């Protein structure tokens, strides 16, 4: 009876050290072709929480379980109870397999129509396995993908607002694909929430990953980065210098429509922008970048209206409409009203003369609110310096250091 | 306040579901709350998040979404006309009118700021109240209006420890 000896060894190895022997034993799987674990599962699972059975779940999910061995509901409930009530510390000893399980869950949810119900599971798994609140794990990518596919961007916000420092190794199973797709999906989530600055940051982080080949995630990140830089700013932001010199010569020719879109955007002519958008409408529709292109079209008008304030103190509605090509005083008035409403511009409308006056005197920097703002900026900078000093001391205490120096 | 705890309760209700889809009343309540807080991105994403079958099953979701499109285009006069087109459920009867009041205040801001002189008809369309709110402008608020031209004129309305922390950080 090999199974009895195996389960006895599993029970004894728990809370007794020698975790390497147990890990090797779970790695020696594939001979458990019998599927009679269903009736014997519900005897020890409740007892002593769930300090085991992660490996058995991993080897159950992958072996030709397309409809989860037609027991999707039961397996989903099993993993729900496992993750909800867990030690957290012992399983942290072997994160790799855990991450794989999460990956399988994603592959079991995004497929047909229902990627939403699993968001709240990887949500707990992320903070159950990760070192600290700022540490990149492969499950972050799966959570971002589930939030993107389910059109539920709010749950992923606390796991995107924090800045990643150090990445979990996952026993060497953390591929660069996880990093690239996590940052790409975070960028798409932020663009969905109109947070274009952080979306641009995420896209730039995805692009600047060192590489020697061409990745479709990287190319889509490049396209969306160009679009977001055209929306938030008036130009394509220059990529950081510390990027791979080979990947930056092949991706650029592929994304030529977006580069010429930026080139015609820099001319401040909405008509040519619309003509060229209609000329490569197929490229944007195929890449599903439509909606961002219309946002660029509207941002061109907004930027023209903003530039009107860099020259004028007071301008007629007809003059503004003729200058920025909205073809109508009423459309220009609505545009300026929306711009003031969002705080993007300081102006007032006088309907008696149909005039717009720009009051470019917002702040005198002499109030306690600016004192608090500078205090918050200083606190962020101080915590940044503290993290840098901690990393420096950690790299100094490392045995390889000093020996090489 | 109590609004924070209520939002926490809705977050709890949304977090777990029998199959990831909750009851239509709570979905409508969440969409109405999203419209109330001007968080329109999450509102539209919730609207597309609803499965098409349950979306077409009930017309209350359709009315809530039509209100959402009306407020998305910033069409202020039509917001009140659309909000009155349908009748809401009893449990949300008094709060939705409160939402209207919120929009009221919003329009007031959009008149107090970004408008030196506003046509009386346009002001009334923005605030929704036909002619009587104009009176509230002069008698109560304190503006100055004039007749025969219909030109409304809106008027525009613990540390030592911190410094010790700064010096301690900089000196080391």
């Amino acid at each position: 009876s090999a199974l009895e000896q195996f389960v006895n060894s599993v029970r004894q190895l728990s809370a007794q050290g020698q975790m390497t022997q147990l890990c090797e034993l779970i790695n020696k799987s594939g001979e458990l072709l019998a599927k009679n674990l269903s009736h014997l599962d519900t005897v020890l699972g409740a007892l002593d929480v769930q300090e085991h059975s992660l490996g058995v779940l991993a080897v159950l999910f992958v072996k030709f379980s397309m409809p989860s061995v037609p027991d999707f509901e039961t397996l989903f409930s099993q993993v729900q109870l496992f993750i909800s009530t867990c030690n957290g510390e012992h399983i942290r000893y072997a994160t790799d397999t855990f991450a794989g399980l999460c990956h399988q869950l994603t592959n079991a949810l995004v497929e047909r129509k229902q990627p939403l119900r699993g968001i709240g599971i990887l949500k707990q798994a992320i903070d159950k396995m990760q070192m600290n609140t700022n540490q990149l794990t492969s499950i972050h990518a799966d959570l971002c993908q589930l939030c993107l596919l389910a059109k539920c961007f709010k749950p992923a916000l606390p796991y995107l607002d924090v800045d990643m420092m150090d990445i979990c190794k996952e026993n060497g199973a953390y591929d660069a694909k996880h990093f690239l797709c996590y940052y790409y999906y975070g960028g798409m989530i932020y663009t969905g929430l109109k947070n274009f600055e952080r979306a641009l940051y995420f896209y730039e982080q995805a692009i600047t990953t060192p590489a020697m080949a061409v990745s479709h995630i990287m190319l889509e990140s490049y396209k969306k980065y160009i679009l977001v830089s055209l929306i938030l700013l008036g130009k394509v932001q220059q990529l950081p210098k510390y990027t791979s010199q080979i990947v930056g010569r092949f991706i650029k020719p592929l994304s030529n429509a977006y580069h010429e879109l930026a080139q015609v955007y820099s001319t401040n002519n909405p008509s040519e922008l619309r003509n060229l958008v209609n000329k490569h409408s197929e490229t944007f529709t195929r890449d599903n970048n439509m909606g961002l292109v219309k946002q660029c079209l509207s941002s061109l008008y907004k930027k023209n209206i903003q530039r009107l304030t860099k020259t004028f103190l007071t301008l007629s509605l007809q003059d503004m409409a003729s200058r920025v090509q909205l073809s109508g005083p009423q459309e220009a008035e609505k545009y300026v009203l929306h711009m003031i409403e969002d705080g993007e511009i300081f102006a007032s409308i006088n309907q008696k003369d149909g005039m717009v006056s720009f009051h470019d005197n917002p702040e005198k920097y002499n109030n306690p609110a600016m004192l608090h703002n500078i205090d918050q900026e200083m606190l962020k900078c101080i915590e940044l310096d503290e993290r840098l000093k901690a990393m420096d001391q950690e790299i100094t205490v490392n045995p390889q250091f000093v020996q090489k120096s | 306040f109590s609004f924070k705890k209520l939002l926490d309760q809705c977050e709890n209700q949304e977090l777990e579901a029998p199959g990831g889809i909750a009851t239509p009343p709570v979905y409508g309540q969440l969409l109405a709350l999203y419209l109330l807080h001007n968080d329109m991105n999450n509102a539209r994403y919730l609207w597309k998040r609803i499965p098409p079958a349950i979306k077409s099953a009930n017309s209350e979701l359709g009315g809530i979404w039509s209100v959402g499109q009306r407020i998305w285009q910033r069409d202020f006069p039509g917001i009140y006309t659309t909000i009155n087109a349908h009748q809401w459920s009893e449990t949300v009867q008094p709060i939705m009118e409160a939402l209207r009041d919120a929009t009221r205040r919003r329009a007031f801001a959009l008149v107090s700021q970004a408008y030196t002189s506003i046509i009386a008809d346009d002001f009334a369309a923005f605030v929704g109240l036909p002619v009587e709110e104009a009176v509230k402008g002069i008698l109560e608020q304190g503006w100055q209006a004039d007749s025969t031209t219909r030109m409304v004129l809106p008027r525009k309305p613990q540390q030592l420890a911190r410094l010790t922390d700064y010096v301690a950080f900089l000196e080391n």
């Binding site: 001391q393 045995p399 000093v402 | -």
Partner: peptide, 24 residues
């Protein structure tokens, strides 16, 4: 200030300890 000095001296002690054991 005392915490900063203590941390600096502890880091110094650790690095010289690692330097001593690295000279085998």
């Amino acid at each position: 200030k005392e915490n900063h000095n203590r941390t600096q001296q502890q880091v110094e002690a650790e690095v010289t300890n690692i330097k001593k054991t690295l000279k085998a």
